[PDB]
Structure 1
Amino acid sequence: AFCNLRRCELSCRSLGLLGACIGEECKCVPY
């Protein structure tokens, strides 16, 4: 299985971050 990486990005774009993935679990971070 993959991350919901598009939803992960879109959920953190409102916070000003770039979303990424580890295995199937996602995290976002500032520029």
Structure 2
Amino acid sequence: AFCNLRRCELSCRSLGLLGKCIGEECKCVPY
């Protein structure tokens, strides 16, 4: 599915990660 990525990606990008959608919720990893 898609994710509520407006929660994660604008907080994960500062470490040089991306916000990745894990079916229906976000985790973060580079890159």
Q: TM-score range by the shorter chain?
A: 0.5 to 0.7
Aligned length: 31
Structure 1 runs not aligned, ≥5 long? none
Higher strand share: 1
TM-score (norm 2): 0.56
TM-score (norm 1): 0.56
Aligned-CA RMSD value: 1.9
Question: Percent identity at matched positions?
Answer: 97
What's the secondary structure of 1:5's corresponding residue? coil
Deviations 1:5-28 (A, max 9, x none): 112001101111110223443101
Structure 2 runs not aligned, ≥5 long? none
Higher helix share: 1
